[PDB]
Amino acid sequence: SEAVIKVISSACKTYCGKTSPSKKEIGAMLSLLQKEGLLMSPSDLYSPGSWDPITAALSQRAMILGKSGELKTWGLVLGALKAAREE
């Protein structure tokens, strides 16, 4: 799951624009989406269609639990992959 972090760690710097996530966060997110039962692999981040239930899910967890670390990474990592498919 190294190629799934390089494609985002390099793309976010072009999409997010001085607002990319943290290297330690990316690894703490791609692994969460799996256990959460959202995706089966980190490369699934390139699947524009399941972000709906995934985005609303992480947004609800931050509230129920109270934290917002993982969700923060999703909101950013998604801000890039979203503009990717476009252009």
- Where in the chain are the domains? 1-87
Stated length of the chain: 87
| 70 touches 29 (CB < 8 A) | yes
Coil vs helix vs strand at 39: coil
Residue 27: how many other CB atoms lie within 10 Å: 16
| Backbone CA torsion sign across 47, 28, 31, 10 | positive
**Alpha-carbon separation of residue 61 from 32, 69, 84 (angstroms):** 12, 10, 26
Contacts of 84 (CB under 8 A, 6+ apart): 11, 15, 46
Burial class (CB in 10 A: 0-12, 13-18, 19+), 74: buried
